[PDB]
């Protein structure tokens, strides 16, 4: 049994919910939340924009200490860092930025950095800003996350469109 309530049960591994990702970390206080990240770690806007402002820029003022140390990440590549006052973790993962011309298949590399850790709270990668279609996004999470995901989807006219198209 884990504290994540009312989601809504799409597969085995794969739950869903219509929620700002943002509000559900801070009540739940997951082990992890997976932050929609670019491989900068520029957290400007987005949910990256949404979780560094929870966090009053902390995870910015960290991120750009990893960044200097490692250099930036690969697309489809993830770090562990801290998730601050909203999660134990934060995996930082990059979806590819349709927006910026990156391969679509890299998002399935994206969401098998999911299957190092158990249970995780997260967005649909390469959703929004990132230009992907979500349905597809969602897809590729199902096929590709073995691990027990609990995805939150901001939009409530997307979250029943993805809950309805679902196969
Ligand atoms: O939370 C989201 N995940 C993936 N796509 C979107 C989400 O919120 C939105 C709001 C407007 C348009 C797309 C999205």
Redesign the pocket.
């Known amino acids: 049994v884990n504290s994540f309530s009312g989601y809504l049960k799409l597969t085995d591994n794969v739950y869903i919910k219509n929620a700002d990702?943002v509000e559900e970390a801070k009540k739940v206080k997951p082990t992890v939340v997976v932050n929609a990240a670019n491989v900068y770690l520029k957290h400007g806007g987005g949910?990256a924009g949404a979780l560094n402002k929870a966090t009053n820029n902390a995870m910015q003022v960290e991120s750009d200490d990893y960044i200097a140390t490692n250099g930036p990440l690969k697309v489809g590549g993830s770090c562990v860092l801290s998730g601050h006052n909203l999660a134990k973790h934060c995996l930082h993962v990059v979806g590819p930025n349709v927006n910026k011309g990156e391969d679509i298949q890299l998002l399935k590399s994206a969401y098998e950095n999911f299957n190092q850790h158990e249970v995780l709270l997260a967005?649909?990668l390469s959703?929004?800003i990132f230009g992907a279609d979500?349905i597809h996004?969602l897809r590729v999470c199902v096929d590709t996350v073995r691990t027990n995901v609990y995805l939150?989807?901001?939009?409530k006219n997307?979250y029943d469109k993805l809950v309805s198209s679902f196969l």
């Open positions: 990702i949910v967005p649909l959703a929004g979500p996004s939150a989807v901001f939009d997307l």
